[PDB]
Amino acid sequence: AESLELPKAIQDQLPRLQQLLKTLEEAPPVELQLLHECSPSQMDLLCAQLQLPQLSDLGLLRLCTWLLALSPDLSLSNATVLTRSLFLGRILSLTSSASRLLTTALTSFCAKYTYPVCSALLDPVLQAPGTGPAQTELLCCLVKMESLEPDAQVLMLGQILELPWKEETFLVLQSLLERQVEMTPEKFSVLMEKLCKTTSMAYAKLMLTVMTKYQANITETQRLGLAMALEPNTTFLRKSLKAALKHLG
């Protein structure tokens, strides 16, 4: 509609590429190597031109399969672009848990393009309404990844901390914090200030884990902000909370 120009060789090879994708449901081509010609904005259109959201789940991985072999790397922005064409609709579609395929596909794709998948997908899935069990699980897998190195884990941390927090955010956040992922006191304090703000079962776990693991980063100020948070008896396990709370006292 903007009349973005796709690169010459991609526009001209545009039926061959939709041909090779049909091939996939049934070693990657030089036609697949043409992605390296695109700017992301060209790419952005291109993905929309190829109708990657419509691949089978297998056909997605079998793309991801072929994509996973690609040297050079599809750049940060391009890999990001791709994934959210490919995966996002299926993700948002989900009424129940993913296929083994997707989770593998996701996680495998996330294995190489960890942060790009991570940079793309985390944020807008959560800010979607009716983000439920199906969705949060696969998000667990991003932040549970052996693959997720300290850099990516705090990219996750950096990325999670930008979001409107809610129950579903905490679930995923606990699972990142579970690893003993390290933080600036700044980053942690943002966790803390957000964290201090209460009646959900999930919330309690989040507080509790930090109170225990990053006792080593809990200041006076921050401990007192928990104290107020745990005031309520809405909270089950106030006692274990109080004990861990007290165990810093």
Partner 1 sequence: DSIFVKLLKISGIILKTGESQNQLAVDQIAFQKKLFQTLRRHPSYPKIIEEFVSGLESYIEDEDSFRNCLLSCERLQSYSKSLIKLLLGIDILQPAIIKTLFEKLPEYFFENKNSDEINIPRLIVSQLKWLDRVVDGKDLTTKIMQLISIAPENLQHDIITSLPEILGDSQHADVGKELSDLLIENTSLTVPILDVLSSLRLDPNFLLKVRQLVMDKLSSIRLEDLPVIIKFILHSVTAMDTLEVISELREKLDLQHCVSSGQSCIILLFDVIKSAIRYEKTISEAWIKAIENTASVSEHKVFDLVMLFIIYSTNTQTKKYIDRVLRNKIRSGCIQEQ
Partner 2 sequence: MAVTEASLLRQCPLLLPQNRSKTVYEGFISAQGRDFHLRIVLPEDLQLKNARLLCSWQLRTILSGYHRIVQQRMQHSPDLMSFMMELKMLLEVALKNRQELYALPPPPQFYSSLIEEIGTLGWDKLVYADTCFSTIKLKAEDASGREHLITLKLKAKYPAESPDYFVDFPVPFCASWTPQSSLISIYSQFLAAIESLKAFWDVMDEIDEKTWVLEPEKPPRSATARRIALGNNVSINIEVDPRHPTMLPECFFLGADHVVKPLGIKLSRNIHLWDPENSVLQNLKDVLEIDFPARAILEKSDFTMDCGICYAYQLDGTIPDQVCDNSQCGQPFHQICLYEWLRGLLTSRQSFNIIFGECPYCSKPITLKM
Closest CA to 66 of 76, 77, 55: 55
163 CB contacts (<8 Å, ≥6 apart)? Answer: 123, 126, 127, 169
77 versus 99: smaller Cβ distance to partner 1: 99
* Contacting residue, 96, 129, 186, 249, with partner 1 by CB under 8 A: 96
Burial class (CB in 10 A: 0-12, 13-18, 19+), 111: middle
Is position 90 an interface residue for partner 1 (rule: CB under 8 A)?
no
CA distances to 27, 46, 110 from 43, in Å:
22, 5, 19
122's tokens: 């985390």
Least distance from C-beta 39 to partner 2, angstroms? 5
* Contacting residue, 38, 98, 142, 157, with partner 1 by CB under 8 A: 98
Is position 238 an interface residue for partner 1 (rule: CB under 8 A)?
yes
81 versus 143: smaller Cβ distance to partner 2: 81
186's tokens: 């700044």
Span 60-79, contacts to partner 1 by CB under 8 A: 61
Q: Are 227 and 242 in contact (CB under 8 A)?
A: no
Residue recorded with tokens 């991570």: 118
Least distance from C-beta 154 to partner 1, angstroms? 21
115 versus 203: smaller Cβ distance to partner 1: 203
Is position 99 an interface residue for partner 1 (rule: CB under 8 A)?
yes
* Contacting residue, 101, 161, 163, 190, with partner 1 by CB under 8 A: 101
- Residue 239 interacts, among partner 1, partner 2, none and using kind-specific CB cut-offs from 5 to 8 Å, with partner 1
Long-range contacts of 41-45 (CB under 8 A, 24+ apart): 41/4, 42/4, 42/5, 42/6, 42/7, 42/10, 43/77, 43/78, 43/81, 43/82, 44/4, 44/81, 45/4, 45/6
What is the distance between the alpha carbons of residues 139 and 46, in angstroms, rounded to a whole number?
27
Is position 97 an interface residue for partner 1 (rule: CB under 8 A)?
yes
Span 177-206, contacts to partner 1 by CB under 8 A: 178, 201, 204-205
Least distance from C-beta 18 to partner 1, angstroms? 22
- Interacting residue ranges for partner 1, rule: CB under 8 A: 57-58, 61, 96-101, 103, 133, 137, 178, 201, 204-205, 208-209, 212-213, 236-241, 243-244
